């Protein structure tokens, strides 16, 4: 009925000759989670080199609320972007997840309209059976994912609607 494409992509260079080298194998798989219920999406973020989780991030991409635009009224997007990030230091249940010293959120006013998150876990120094636990780091199943491979569950997101970048 439509038809569909594809693309391709090859590099070409010459050999290593180098007088340095780093033993520091780091990949980020970046795995493009479908849309949400509607309007609303986000990724997942991976590092791994082994067969390990050393980190997991979890972005966020949706349109705001009407409490914002509110303050997006009053003031405008040149302070409400301010406002957002202080409304992370006064949020008990951030303060209650930064006590953590392998765990980070950044929050941005991407328009008047719209905003960014992400939440980083730091496997090496996440204390996960409190990661697991903290209102926020509850919905998550950061228990379910440790007990497989880093790669095993990438090929079920594909499986269960995702993508990959």
């Not at 609303?40 to 409490?67: C, G, H, M, N």
Request: glycine share 4%; charged share 30%.
């Amino acid at each position: 009925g439509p038809a569909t494409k594809t693309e391709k992509d090859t590099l070409q260079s010459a050999l290593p000759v180098i007088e340095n080298a780093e033993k520091n194998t780091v990949v980020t798989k970046t795995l493009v989670l479908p849309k949400s219920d509607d309007g609303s999406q986000q990724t997942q973020t991976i590092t791994y080199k082994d067969k390990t989780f050393l980190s997991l991030a979890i972005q966020q991409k949706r349109p705001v609320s009407d409490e914002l635009k509110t303050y997006i009224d009053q003031h405008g997007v040149e302070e409400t972007q301010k406002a957002l990030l202080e409304a992370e230091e006064k949020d008990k249940s951030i303060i209650e997840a930064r006590k953590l010293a392998g765990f980070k959120l950044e929050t941005k006013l991407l328009s008047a309209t719209e905003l960014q998150t992400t939440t980083s876990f730091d496997f090496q120094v996440l204390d996960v059976k409190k990661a697991s636990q903290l209102e926020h780091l509850k919905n998550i199943g950061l228990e379910n994912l440790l007990k497989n491979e880093p790669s095993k569950y990438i090929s079920d997101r594909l499986a269960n609607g995702a993508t990959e970048q």
